[PDB]
Design a protein around this ligand. Sequence first.
Ligand SMILES: [Ca+2]
Length: 615
Amino acid sequence: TGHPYYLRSFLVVLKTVLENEDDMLLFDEQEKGIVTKFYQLSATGQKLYVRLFQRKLSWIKMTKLEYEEIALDLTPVIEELTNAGFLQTESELQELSEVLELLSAPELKSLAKTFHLVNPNGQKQQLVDAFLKLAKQRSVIGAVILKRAKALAGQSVRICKGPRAVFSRILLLFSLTDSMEDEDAACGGQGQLSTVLLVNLGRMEFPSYTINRKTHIFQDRDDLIRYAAATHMLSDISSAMANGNWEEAKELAQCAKRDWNRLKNHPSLRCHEDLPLFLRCFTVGWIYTRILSRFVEILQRLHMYEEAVRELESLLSQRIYCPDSRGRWWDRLALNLHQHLKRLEPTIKCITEGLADPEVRTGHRLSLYQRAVRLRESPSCKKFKHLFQQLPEMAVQDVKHVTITGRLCKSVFVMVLCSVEELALAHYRRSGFDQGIHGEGSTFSTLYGLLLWDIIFMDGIPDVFRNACQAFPLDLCTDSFFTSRRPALEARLQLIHDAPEESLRAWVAATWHEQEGRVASLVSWDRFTSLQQAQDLVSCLGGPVLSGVCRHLAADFRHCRGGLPDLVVWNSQSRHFKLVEVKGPNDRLSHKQMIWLAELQKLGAEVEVCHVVAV
DNA sequence: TAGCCACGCCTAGACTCCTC
DNA sequence: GCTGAGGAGTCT
DNA sequence: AGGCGTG
Ligand SMILES: [Ca+2]
């Protein structure tokens, strides 16, 4: 008796966002009516709207619409939607380019024929450039082309962009808490649900926690609209870059740079600046800064390094937005000054201020440190003593390396075809470790989530849980996660350190039994093949190791989540384990990886780098 | 005879968009 | 240069 | 678009 998957999900999105009065303040009466109009539709009207909401925004020939699960004849349904203001008809189709677009290339030929002034052959794009040229000069003949084009195209529908824009903004608000937020969304088509959410949201069961909110994110409807707009801008700039369209990207960035300067002094920014970091990420400012970051990337790719440096300096000169990015910025400033602008004095000042910055961390911190020693210990630099300046000797302990071979066929090897990691897994099986998981950071991260679940979903921290569909407290990736739960963390971390390998087995099984399936960002239910396999692994790893790992992930998940080895292997009977990073022929350790290995060693654990050489 | 042309049919491969 | 896989309809 | 037959 249920709705189809896509309608359930879409329904869960609206429900979630509607139950917040905070959030509905950011919609006017007109806009809210659109939501009611939607609920007012029939099950069929609702189904059809969502289908088309999920598809690209443009005209669709009536003969290209078919959803048998909806209705064998869609016209009463289209009618309902056109009545309610959601859909529109070939009647409202008025722009020429649009009608030309909706026509098949054959149909564009026929229309090229029954119009004498046209050269009947050429690509679909060609004919269109032509027909549009024609109508721009001799306008009245253009109206005739339009008329016949339309009649040729037949009956058509298109989603109405006004009601659609409302749902985008509803989807956006749903997604600061869930969707887009868990690594920002591509959001093509104008703002649909992600495939994953569309398919699963309706079925997802979330962890239980208590919604408690005390602070507004957006000033008013206008604020939310400015944000939305920055979001769309950023997404486009990203997409440009993803497609190697750097000149386009540049222009957009520049344009976005101006807008953000036009918004300076605006009263809303006063309140934004005053939000806690875990909220401040949801402000126009944050998003523009994020844009300004892509801008340096863009400049750098166009080898415009002087400019890149200027932007980097701007970025670094403020502490309001994206403090987590400073490590990357500093590192990047340094690299540019050193390698491209070849300017060794500032390179040193840069490195020093960088290292003096409590915001730079793990990977980038190390990368800046290494740059300092490479420099201070160099001839063409020796003409100074400004890098002897009390640099903490932050060395990283070396780790046992090893090598194996595998016949080479993402590099695929033949053993059956397999990855570099699978090849190592094989080696470690013949080396006596009957068990193994290739899970990089998710193995540790799901252990951490299993062991600290109840702390992670703890009550008592205002603003971290704003609605029903979160898979994590909003501060999880903030310095504040730890600090806002200091007593409880220190407790549990300690209890883990001291725990016997049966305490661990039991704790894990507690969470597993009460939460299995519940959606939480740290935990992958399928990561371990069973609860027993999770139990075996915590027995081998033991209290002191697990405790150290959890401390890192809870102190600074943001800068620690990356770098954990590819592999965890263990011998069933000896209980001896090994944490292994697999490196194929052409890759070395990243800074994050070396920091993690040293740290795992310190916690007393067998860590190995395993290089595969190919035949 | 080889070698050049003219003409139209048919489809592989790419591409877009959609689906779960 | 990737972060989903596969199918259908289209274009040329 | 471009391979292919056909005449
Ligand atoms: Ca690896």
